[PDB]
Design a binder for these strands. Structure first.
Lengths: 291, 171, 199, 190, 130, 106
RNA sequence: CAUCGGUUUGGAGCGGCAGGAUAAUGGCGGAGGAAUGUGGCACGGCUUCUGCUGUGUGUUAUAGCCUCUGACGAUACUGCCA
RNA sequence: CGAUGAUUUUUGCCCUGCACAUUUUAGAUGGAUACGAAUAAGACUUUUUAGUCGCUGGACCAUAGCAGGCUGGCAACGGUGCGCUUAGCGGAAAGGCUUUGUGCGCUUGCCGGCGGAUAGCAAUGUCAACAUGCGCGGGGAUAAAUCCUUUGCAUACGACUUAG
């Protein structure tokens, strides 16, 4: 028999499985499409969500009841110390997708980024990137050979940059290291820009402008194991139900003789990878600004 | 089938009343002489008060083609049974032998009308001597003067499964 | 006919099912087969009809768990592989070993770009289809059903064709001088004797 | 019936040089050159002389034979498009709101812009195919001239202009407004 | 000019020479149907055959009347000397070479190998300087 | 001198079988270069050797042979039926055999 | 491996004989006739008439065909060979 | 599936030149012998008229030597293998394709001399590539992870983010 009355689903099937994110750092699934005409610039940045605050703003929207009127809005603060460029990766387009052909590193890597490659830094000899550091023996011909390979073969050039986490109030000492795609210019232009930026800092003022619309990639707040009532927002059962009421009453018909993937079940809630689009940049503030 | 044209001659069994019964002849297109005599009785009983028991087969002879190596146009008058009723058609065929035009006809009625050998009666097979005697356009187009035509897109059958060179269809 | 170590089939201009059946019988009999240029295969019938057939294929999936269902691969090589696997007892160890003998690719990747590619006349579209019949290219169907790498494959294919054209120009230049040299050594005692033997 | 042979006789005027290779027709005449690909039809061409070409189908059934006179007509259209031209004359039809048609050029591509069709605020843009010339008449009011060599492109542009002005949700027997092809002829009078 | 590329087909007509069984020569004396012809020749029985069983050759027996009988076919075949024209083509030469190769023995194959070695020596010597 | 082969290459194709039941006593052999029953009738009565390797040494050799002979042709495509002293194991479906040139009648 | 005996599957198997319309055809000779009319002839459009070609005429000419037939001579097909 | 960092002061590890021996083979037993495209079309020449080629790979290359030995001469200054060695190209899974000079061989292009027997009238009559192990030689480098305590951006427990 059909449902007596119609009702939409509880939850979206496009966000399955509702599992924990593989990493705490949200990875950029898709980078903006490359436009050769545009100047060479970065497409992403890493910051730290500090907290939320309130602003007051003069609304500019003709035809609205709040035109030329003040509106109180919630704002979010992302602490963004400049990122340090340490590497460059070339990607060759293949009939099976993009394939990383070559990775070139800067001569010197800071301690906070070399800690990224260690699980027990205090017990180690800190041998990471020492032979590679010697690969710069006053001529570094291997480095320019690999960069020539990247120029000749790569179709997508990305930069390896890490946050300066010591400038944040966080107690973590490991830096966060990520690939940020370089858009604009030819592959040679991208490689030259990446090489000239080795061991250098890049500020948000060069990447994001004021009034820009940007997307946020992050892993959401975790809640642990969660019942169907709060995980999916299903209707609570009546008060007089035996064995509890925070359940889904019917988890399927007799046939198919299986539980469908579309039925709400208890499980892990939150700590999911989310991409949220169209967030407006109200301010790009400077650390050197005391106001 | 692989047919032959037979002369079958039969008559009613002689009786004290009728001591010299009339002799009846037919031309039968049958694969062999066993079907030839069987088909002969099948048509006398459609036309005369006689049976295989009350009759007698007098002669069964093959009628060979007079000119097996001359191209002729045969007009065939038929009577076949369809899924709904009984119809008469007249069709024309080009071949060298009289049997071969009948063999083509049986293949043609099977292909175009789903008519089986049991459902077909051949009323008459006639040689069209004059070009004016030909009525069907699908055989007159081969009676035009200085007829020439190529055979485009020749397909060659291979002995090996794999061929190391690119195929071609010239001819 | 001859037991070859590896047979490399240029898949251009071949019909999917007939090539699939021939290749299935080949690999079941212990022959190693590599099919290249699977995006150039052909299927009889118009493009829309085959697209509808593939959409009928896509509609079939396991109801209770879409992850357990049939896996609808969009790549042309995988379409050829599905056709071939349908003609192999793939749930036995013998069929598993037979399918281990098969490779299918889009384009002509290394090292097969410098090897000899053969055709199968029993499955060639130009030799099998009636000249007026409509047909579909597996690459276009794959693009229509979700395959993403058609442009990459065509770019790499034109690069490989440039390389092979240079190779063939060199080979034709070399062969031309050899034919001239053998003509100089013709009408000699060895040449005259060889002709009387059929060589 | 698999007709044994079917023939058509293409006639070439004096100033036109047809040139066919592997079923690719390349017609060159005083007004320029046009090309048509006919690889989807199995026909053979034989040059009777400089002014007559035979188009032949061997052993063709009803549809394959039907595909022959269409080939002849298409090549004849190519011939007459490079020697006499093609011109479609459209008239603007409106009851209350005049249709304002302009020939604009945006982003380096020509467009036909239609405004105030039935008083709608929507602006209609029709892309102009390469080789096709659109013109606002001086001799006639509310008339647009679509000229070119390729009859296919000229007629397709005229059809696009006619189709983009379709009346919706109204009795079209009463609301006869639109842009319709009034005349189909050649650029060169005959 | 027009410069129209025309087909180089072989036509089925009276006098067209054909190969039957890949061994004998014959000529088409009359066209029966689209798929069938009547063939005759000095060394082959006058018969009605399918065009799929025969292969058209680039040789045509000129001025042969339609429906010509065996005597006239033989007379005109001898007059035009079809056999010498056939033997002078590379097709017949390849067929004869294949037959001759098939009629070789092991000793003859060894001799062919030795002679091929000698001719290869001479050819490489000529090639290094040319 | 590069080639020392005195046998014809063959392949073990299958057992004699209907759709559902197999007869291991008869093996079907594909001979290289044979595509017609006329060609395959040359090899009738010739000896067949299946040569394989085994873990244990037998008189210093790790190579063992199963002997057989061609008995009749199979089908229309030049396959032959072979009778071996010990039936060829099913694991050899697709393996190569040796069609020896004796008992000669040339 | 050879030979034997029994069963059996074959060969591009070979030869001999018989029958049929004592095959029908075909080749040869004779008689007659016609057209999808060869040559020729008469009008033509493109060719220094460059398998030129079309339309008419009529009956083997610078091709031939069809029907009837007279004496031969084969083969096909089906049987048999102790 | 890819790229990248570091890879045990242990008698352990990596690379490489040999040599010996082992387990395995979905199954070497001369060579996987490379344009592309069309097919009612291709490729040559004269000319764009026409002629010729294909009508299958029964092809081409390689193939003679105790499973290929030991020796000699002649003719050419070639061919081929191995070894260093020069340069270029190849990123789709490039891991291969050409190339420079040079040394050692062999050369069946031709002519010779010596040797093979007995495995007995057949018995696969044992000759291949991959890998591992072990003895040397030549170089080369000198780590991490987990438990534990801590953390709460996490969390039923594992796991996770941290710090030591």
């Amino acid at each position: 028999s059909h449902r007596k009355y119609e009702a939409p689903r509880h939850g979206s099937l496009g966000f399955l499985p509702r599992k924990r994110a593989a990493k705490q750092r949200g990875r950029v699934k898709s980078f903006p499409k490359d436009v050769k005409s545009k100047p060479v610039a970065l497409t992403a940045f890493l910051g730290y969500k500090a907290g939320m605050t309130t602003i007051v703003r003069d609304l500019d929207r003709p035809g609205s009841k709040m035109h030329k009127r003040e509106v109180v809005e919630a704002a979010t603060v992302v602490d963004t110390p400049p990122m340090v460029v340490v590497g460059v990766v070339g990607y060759v387009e293949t009939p099976r997708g993009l394939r990383s052909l070559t990775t070139v590193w800067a001569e010197h890597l800071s301690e906070e980024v070399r800690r990224r490659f260690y699980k027990n830094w205090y017990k180690s000899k800190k041998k990471a990137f020492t032979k590679y550091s010697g690969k710069y023996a006053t001529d570094a011909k291997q480095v320019e050979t690999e960069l020539a390979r990247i120029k000749k073969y790569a179709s997508v050039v990305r930069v390896l940059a890490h946050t300066q986490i010591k400038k944040t109030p966080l107690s973590q000492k490991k830096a966060h290291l990520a690939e940020i795609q370089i858009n604009g210019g030819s592959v040679s232009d991208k490689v030259d820009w990446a090489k000239e930026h080795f061991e250098k800092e890049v500020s948000v003022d060069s990447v994001f402008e004021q009034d820009e619309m940007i997307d946020v990639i992050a892993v959401t707040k975790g809640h642990g194991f969660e019942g169907v009532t709060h995980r999916w927002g299903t209707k609570k059962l009546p008060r007089k139900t035996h064995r509890g009421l925070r359940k889904v009453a019917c988890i399927g018909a007799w046939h198919p003789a299986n539980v469908n993937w579309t039925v709400a079940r208890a499980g892990q809630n939150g700590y999911h990878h989310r991409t949220s689009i169209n967030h407006k940049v109200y301010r790009v503030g400077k650390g050197t600004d005391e106001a | 089938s692989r047919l032959n044209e037979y002369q079958v001659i039969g008559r009613n069994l002689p009786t004290e009343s009728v001591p010299e019964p009339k002799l009846f002849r037919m031309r039968i297109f049958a694969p062999n002489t066993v079907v030839a005599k069987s088909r002969y009785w099948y048509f006398l009983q459609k036309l005369h008060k006689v049976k295989k028991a009350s009759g007698e087969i007098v002669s069964v002879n093959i009628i060979s083609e007079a000119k097996p190596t001359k191209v002729k146009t045969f007009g065939i008058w038929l009577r076949y049974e369809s899924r709904s009723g009984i119809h008469n058609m007249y069709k024309e065929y080009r071949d060298v032998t009289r049997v071969g035009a009948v063999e083509t006809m049986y293949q043609d009625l099977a292909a175009r009308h789903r008519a089986r050998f049991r459902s077909i009666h051949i009323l008459k097979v006639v040689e069209l001597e004059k070009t004016d005697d030909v009525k069907r356009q699908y055989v007159k187009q081969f009676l035009t003067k200085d007829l020439k035509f190529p055979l485009p897109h020749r397909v060659q059958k291979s002995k090996k499964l794999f061929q190391a060179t690119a195929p071609t269809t010239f001819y | 006919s001859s037991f070859e170590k590896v047979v490399v089939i240029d898949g251009k201009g071949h019909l999917l099912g007939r090539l699939a059946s021939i290749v299935s019988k080949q690999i079941l009999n212990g022959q190693k087969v590599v099919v290249v240029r699977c995006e150039e295969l052909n299927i009889s019938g118009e493009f829309f009809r085959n697209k509808l057939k593939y959409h009928d294929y896509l509609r079939k999936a396991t109801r209770y768990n879409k992850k357990k269902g049939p896996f609808h691969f969009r790549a042309p090589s995988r379409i050829l592989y599905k056709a071939i696997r349908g003609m192999i007892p793939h749930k036995t160890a013998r069929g598993k070993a037979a399918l281990e003998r098969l490779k299918v690719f889009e384009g002509v990747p290394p090292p097969y770009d410098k090897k000899k590619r053969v055709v199968v006349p029993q499955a060639l579209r130009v030799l099998r289809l009636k000249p007026g019949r409509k047909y579909t290219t597996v690459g276009k169907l794959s693009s229509a059903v979700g395959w993403k790498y058609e442009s990459v494959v065509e770019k790499l294919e034109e690069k490989r064709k440039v390389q092979s054209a240079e190779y063939y120009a060199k080979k034709k230049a070399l062969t031309k001088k050899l034919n001239a040299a053998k003509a100089s050594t013709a009408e000699s005692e060895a040449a005259q004797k060889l002709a009387a033997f059929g060589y | 019936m698999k007709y044994i042979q079917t023939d058509q006789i293409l006639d070439i005027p004096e100033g036109v040089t047809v040139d066919i290779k592997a079923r690719v027709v390349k017609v060159t005449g005083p007004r320029g050159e046009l090309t048509k690909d006919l690889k989807h039809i199995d026909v053979t061409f034989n040059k009777i002389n400089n002014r007559a070409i035979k188009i032949t189908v061997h052993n063709g059934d009803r549809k394959h034979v039907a595909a022959l006179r269409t080939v002849k007509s298409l090549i004849a259209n190519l011939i007459t498009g490079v020697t006499k031209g093609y011109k479609y004359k459209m008239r603007f039809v409106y009851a209350h709101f005049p249709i304002n048609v302009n020939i604009i050029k945006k982003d380096g591509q020509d467009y036909v812009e239609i405004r105030n069709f039935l008083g709608e605020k929507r602006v209609r843009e029709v892309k102009i195919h390469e080789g096709v010339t659109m013109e606002i008449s001086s001799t006639q009011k509310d008339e647009l001239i679509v000229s070119g060599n390729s009859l296919e492109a000229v007629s397709q542009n005229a059809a696009d202009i006619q189709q983009i002005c379709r009346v919706r949700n109204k009795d079209i027997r009463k609301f006869l407004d639109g842009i319709y092809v009034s005349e189909r002829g050649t650029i060169v009078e005959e | 000019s027009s410069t129209v590329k025309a087909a180089n087909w072989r036509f089925v007509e009276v006098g067209r020479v054909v190969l039957v069984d890949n061994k004998e020569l014959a000529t088409i004396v009359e066209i029966i149907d689209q798929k069938r012809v009547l063939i005759d020749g000095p060394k082959i029985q006058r018969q009605a055959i399918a065009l799929a069983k025969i292969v058209l050759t680039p040789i045509v027996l000129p001025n042969l009347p339609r429906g010509s009988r065996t005597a006239t076919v033989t007379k005109k075949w001898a007059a035009a000397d079809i056999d010498a024209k056939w033997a002078a083509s590379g097709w017949a030469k390849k067929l004869a070479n294949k037959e001759r190769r098939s009629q070789l023995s092991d000793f003859e194959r060894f001799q062919v190998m030795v002679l091929k070695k000698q001719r290869r020596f001479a050819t490489k010597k000529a090639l290094v300087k040319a | 001198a590069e080639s020392h082969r005195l046998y014809v290459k063959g392949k073990h194709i299958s057992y004699q079988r209907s759709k559902s039941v197999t007869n291991p006593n008869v093996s079907l052999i594909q001979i290289e270069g044979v595509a017609s029953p006329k060609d395959a009738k040359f090899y009738l009565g010739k000896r067949i050797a299946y040569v394989y390797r085994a873990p244990k040494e037998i008189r210093g050799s790790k190579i063992r042979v199963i002997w057989g002979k061609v008995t009749r042709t199979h089908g229309n495509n030049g396959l032959v039926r072979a009778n071996f002293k010990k039936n060829l194991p099913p694991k050899t479906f697709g393996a190569s055999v040796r069609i020896m040139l004796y008992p000669s009648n040339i």
